[PDB]
Scaffold this active site. Structure first.
Site, PDB file in Angstrom:
ATOM      1  N   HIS A  73      58.165 -44.110 -26.895  1.00  0.00           N
ATOM      2  CA  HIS A  73      59.544 -43.671 -26.780  1.00  0.00           C
ATOM      3  C   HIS A  73      60.006 -43.244 -25.417  1.00  0.00           C
ATOM      4  O   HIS A  73      61.217 -43.177 -25.195  1.00  0.00           O
ATOM      5  CB  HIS A  73      59.876 -42.650 -27.855  1.00  0.00           C
ATOM      6  CG  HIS A  73      59.716 -43.206 -29.230  1.00  0.00           C
ATOM      7  ND1 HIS A  73      60.458 -44.273 -29.686  1.00  0.00           N
ATOM      8  CD2 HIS A  73      58.855 -42.896 -30.225  1.00  0.00           C
ATOM      9  CE1 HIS A  73      60.092 -44.567 -30.918  1.00  0.00           C
ATOM     10  NE2 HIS A  73      59.116 -43.751 -31.264  1.00  0.00           N
ATOM     11  N   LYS A  76      57.007 -55.119 -33.792  1.00  0.00           N
ATOM     12  CA  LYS A  76      57.699 -53.955 -34.312  1.00  0.00           C
ATOM     13  C   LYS A  76      59.198 -54.277 -34.383  1.00  0.00           C
ATOM     14  O   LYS A  76      59.767 -54.743 -33.400  1.00  0.00           O
ATOM     15  CB  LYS A  76      57.426 -52.743 -33.419  1.00  0.00           C
ATOM     16  CG  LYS A  76      58.128 -51.488 -33.896  1.00  0.00           C
ATOM     17  CD  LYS A  76      57.677 -50.281 -33.125  1.00  0.00           C
ATOM     18  CE  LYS A  76      58.311 -49.038 -33.725  1.00  0.00           C
ATOM     19  NZ  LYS A  76      58.544 -48.021 -32.680  1.00  0.00           N
ATOM     20  N   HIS A  84      57.810 -37.533 -33.442  1.00  0.00           N
ATOM     21  CA  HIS A  84      58.499 -38.546 -34.220  1.00  0.00           C
ATOM     22  C   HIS A  84      59.959 -38.623 -33.775  1.00  0.00           C
ATOM     23  O   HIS A  84      60.602 -37.591 -33.558  1.00  0.00           O
ATOM     24  CB  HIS A  84      58.385 -38.218 -35.735  1.00  0.00           C
ATOM     25  CG  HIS A  84      59.366 -38.960 -36.592  1.00  0.00           C
ATOM     26  ND1 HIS A  84      59.236 -40.305 -36.879  1.00  0.00           N
ATOM     27  CD2 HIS A  84      60.530 -38.560 -37.170  1.00  0.00           C
ATOM     28  CE1 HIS A  84      60.260 -40.693 -37.623  1.00  0.00           C
ATOM     29  NE2 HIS A  84      61.064 -39.656 -37.811  1.00  0.00           N
ATOM     30  N   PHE A  85      60.468 -39.838 -33.670  1.00  0.00           N
ATOM     31  CA  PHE A  85      61.866 -40.106 -33.366  1.00  0.00           C
ATOM     32  C   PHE A  85      62.569 -40.397 -34.689  1.00  0.00           C
ATOM     33  O   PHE A  85      62.197 -41.340 -35.360  1.00  0.00           O
ATOM     34  CB  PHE A  85      61.971 -41.312 -32.413  1.00  0.00           C
ATOM     35  CG  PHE A  85      63.297 -41.418 -31.689  1.00  0.00           C
ATOM     36  CD1 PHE A  85      64.396 -41.980 -32.297  1.00  0.00           C
ATOM     37  CD2 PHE A  85      63.432 -40.971 -30.399  1.00  0.00           C
ATOM     38  CE1 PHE A  85      65.623 -42.064 -31.629  1.00  0.00           C
ATOM     39  CE2 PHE A  85      64.651 -41.052 -29.742  1.00  0.00           C
ATOM     40  CZ  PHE A  85      65.735 -41.604 -30.360  1.00  0.00           C
ATOM     41  N   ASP A  86      63.550 -39.568 -35.077  1.00  0.00           N
ATOM     42  CA  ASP A  86      64.258 -39.717 -36.340  1.00  0.00           C
ATOM     43  C   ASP A  86      65.566 -40.540 -36.228  1.00  0.00           C
ATOM     44  O   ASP A  86      65.880 -41.370 -37.085  1.00  0.00           O
ATOM     45  CB  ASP A  86      64.588 -38.357 -36.916  1.00  0.00           C
ATOM     46  CG  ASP A  86      64.349 -38.290 -38.419  1.00  0.00           C
ATOM     47  OD1 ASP A  86      63.292 -38.805 -38.858  1.00  0.00           O
ATOM     48  OD2 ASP A  86      65.186 -37.697 -39.162  1.00  0.00           O
TER      49      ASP A  86
HETATM   50  N1  LIG Z   1      59.857 -34.729 -40.141  1.00  0.00           N
HETATM   51  C1  LIG Z   1      59.122 -35.854 -39.903  1.00  0.00           C
HETATM   52  N2  LIG Z   1      59.477 -37.118 -40.239  1.00  0.00           N
HETATM   53  C2  LIG Z   1      58.669 -38.193 -39.994  1.00  0.00           C
HETATM   54  N3  LIG Z   1      57.475 -38.094 -39.361  1.00  0.00           N
HETATM   55  C3  LIG Z   1      57.032 -36.861 -38.955  1.00  0.00           C
HETATM   56  C4  LIG Z   1      57.851 -35.683 -39.224  1.00  0.00           C
HETATM   57  N4  LIG Z   1      57.236 -34.610 -38.717  1.00  0.00           N
HETATM   58  C5  LIG Z   1      56.076 -35.041 -38.194  1.00  0.00           C
HETATM   59  N5  LIG Z   1      55.954 -36.371 -38.322  1.00  0.00           N
HETATM   60  C6  LIG Z   1      54.772 -37.117 -37.790  1.00  0.00           C
HETATM   61  O1  LIG Z   1      55.078 -38.031 -36.715  1.00  0.00           O
HETATM   62  C7  LIG Z   1      54.069 -39.038 -36.691  1.00  0.00           C
HETATM   63  C8  LIG Z   1      54.668 -40.333 -36.159  1.00  0.00           C
HETATM   64  O2  LIG Z   1      55.609 -40.909 -37.065  1.00  0.00           O
HETATM   65  P1  LIG Z   1      56.119 -42.414 -36.760  1.00  0.00           P
HETATM   66  O3  LIG Z   1      54.954 -43.372 -36.572  1.00  0.00           O
HETATM   67  O4  LIG Z   1      57.228 -42.778 -37.730  1.00  0.00           O
HETATM   68  O5  LIG Z   1      56.720 -42.169 -35.289  1.00  0.00           O
HETATM   69  P2  LIG Z   1      57.984 -42.967 -34.726  1.00  0.00           P
HETATM   70  O6  LIG Z   1      58.071 -42.720 -33.247  1.00  0.00           O
HETATM   71  O7  LIG Z   1      59.144 -42.616 -35.613  1.00  0.00           O
HETATM   72  O8  LIG Z   1      57.595 -44.503 -35.008  1.00  0.00           O
HETATM   73  P3  LIG Z   1      58.681 -45.687 -35.241  1.00  0.00           P
HETATM   74  O9  LIG Z   1      59.206 -45.957 -33.840  1.00  0.00           O
HETATM   75  O10 LIG Z   1      57.801 -46.760 -35.848  1.00  0.00           O
HETATM   76  O11 LIG Z   1      59.725 -45.150 -36.190  1.00  0.00           O
HETATM   77  C9  LIG Z   1      53.486 -39.113 -38.111  1.00  0.00           C
HETATM   78  O12 LIG Z   1      52.054 -39.021 -38.031  1.00  0.00           O
HETATM   79  C10 LIG Z   1      54.067 -37.918 -38.866  1.00  0.00           C
HETATM   80  O13 LIG Z   1      53.087 -37.006 -39.350  1.00  0.00           O
END
Ligand SMILES: Nc1ncnc2c1ncn2[C@@H]1O[C@H](COP(=O)(O)OP(=O)(O)OP(=O)(O)O)[C@@H](O)[C@H]1O
Length: 123
Positions: free
Chosen positions: A11, A40, A118-120
């Protein structure tokens, strides 16, 4: 690889203030191992200091998409770049539409130190 380190790899991009070309995504997705086991589908990169993004863990607390309450929205818009896969992309030739924007980021934080894992979303 720590969840935190993983978040930085997928990210973070301090290197540049933004994407200049329409093929930032192609170079970046490949060079960060995001196109390794498969292509991805979508991935946002954030062009700001790692300190500015980490500071987001004590900004506006909001509800995460998965129901947990460890999400925080940034008070400021930030420079982001959305990569989205093109339907004419086939592994291993992953291809991506580059999109530049200024939006608020939403991240989930964890840990001692409390860092983004994590990116929401972006709004
Ligand atoms: N509130 C939350 N929602 C989702 N994941 C969370 C949350 N809090 C902590 N995490 C953690 O963040 C980690 C990474 O999640 P994820 O792989 O979806 O990251 P990401 O950057 O969102 O990836 P992507 O770009 O594929 O969406 C997970 O191991 C999870 O435990």
């Amino acid at each position: 690889e720590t969840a935190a380190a993983k978040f930085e790899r997928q990210h973070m991009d301090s290197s540049t203030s933004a994407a200049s070309s329409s093929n930032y995504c192609n170079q970046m997705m490949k060079s960060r191992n995001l196109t390794k086991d498969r292509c991805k589908p979508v991935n946002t990169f954030v062009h700001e200091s790692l300190a500015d993004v980490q500071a987001v863990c004590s900004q506006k607390n909001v509800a995460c998409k998965n129901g947990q309450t460890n999400c925080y929205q940034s008070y400021s818009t930030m420079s982001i770049t959305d990569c989205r896969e093109t339907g004419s992309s086939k592994y291993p030739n992953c291809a991506y539409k580059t999109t530049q924007a200024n939006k608020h980021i939403i991240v989930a934080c964890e840990g001692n130190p409390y860092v983004p894992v994590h990116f929401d979303a972006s709004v």
